[PDB]
């Protein structure tokens, strides 16, 4: 029943049980918190954050902590990491989405300071605040909202009103996945005024980040930045994608 609050984390603290010295993880917010709790209680994923409990004392959340860190940590900068880490990752980060798009929930703000790892390098997809319900009753609905981080945003949600959920989670997926492979960014943010984004739509690709990745995870990074949401890849798709099944 008491946990002591060992460290600061991120606000959150890790605690750590009087009696069974188990670890988790509090967020504390002092008053969108309660849709967090409310998506949080529906998730149950071995790529997903685990959601313990909360306290209405200012609010508790209980989360289950992960000893990895963020995986912004695992990529070296102007580097990234070896392939083969890369691709399990990304399978990892496969899993959790097709999981929340499974049960109708966005995410909405996928990067790598919200994939986390466990002790075994496990990811977990964290941080529901500003995720949402697309799919109810068997009815997607669509968004109109602008939610999540510049760099990771697909470019239908800065020239549409309206836009399905799901491949806006696949874009910036691929953004994680270019981030893992190169260790950089490509773009401020998808819009024509950005020189790199431009770029990127006329295939040069001898150009960094792009010149750094391996022509197979490359053809499958063609296939999820493409800036029409109705052309880009599906997620069923990706499963399919040789890189994807490229044993490494
Ligand atoms: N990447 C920053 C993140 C780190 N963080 C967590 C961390 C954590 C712990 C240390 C370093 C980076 C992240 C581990 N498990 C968690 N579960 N829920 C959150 C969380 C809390 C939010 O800030």
């Given at each position: 029943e008491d946990w002591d609050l060992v460290q600061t984390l991120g606000?959150?603290?890790?605690?750590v049980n009087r009696v069974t010295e188990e670890a988790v993880?509090?967020?504390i917010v002092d008053m969108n918190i309660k849709k967090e709790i409310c998506i949080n209680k529906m998730l149950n994923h071995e790529n997903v954050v685990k959601f313990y409990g909360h306290r209405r004392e200012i609010q508790?959340?209980?989360l289950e902590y992960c000893s990895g860190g963020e995986l912004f940590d695992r990529i070296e900068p102007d580097i990234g990491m070896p392939?083969?880490?890369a691709q399990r990752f990304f399978h990892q980060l496969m899993a959790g989405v097709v999981y929340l798009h499974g049960i109708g929930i966005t995410h909405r703000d996928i990067k790598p300071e919200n994939l986390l790892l466990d002790e075994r390098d496990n990811l977990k997809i964290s941080d529901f605040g500003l995720a949402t319900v697309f799919r109810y009753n068997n009815r997607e609905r669509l968004l109109?909202?602008?939610?999540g981080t510049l760099p990771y945003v697909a470019p239908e949600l800065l020239k549409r009103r309206?836009?399905?959920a799901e491949p806006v989670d696949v874009w910036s997926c691929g953004i994680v996945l270019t981030a893992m492979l190169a260790g950089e960014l490509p773009w401020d943010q998808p819009s024509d005024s950005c020189q790199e984004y431009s770029d990127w739509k006329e295939k040069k690709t001898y150009l960094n980040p792009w010149k750094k990745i391996?022509?197979?995870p490359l053809a499958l990074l063609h296939k999820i930045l493409?800036?029409?949401?109705?052309a880009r890849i599906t997620i069923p798709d990706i499963k399919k994608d040789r890189w994807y099944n490229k044993p490494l």
């Open positions: 606000e959150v603290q890790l605690a993880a509090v967020k508790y959340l209980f392939e083969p880490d109109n909202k602008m939610c309206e836009f399905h391996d022509s197979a493409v800036e029409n949401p109705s």
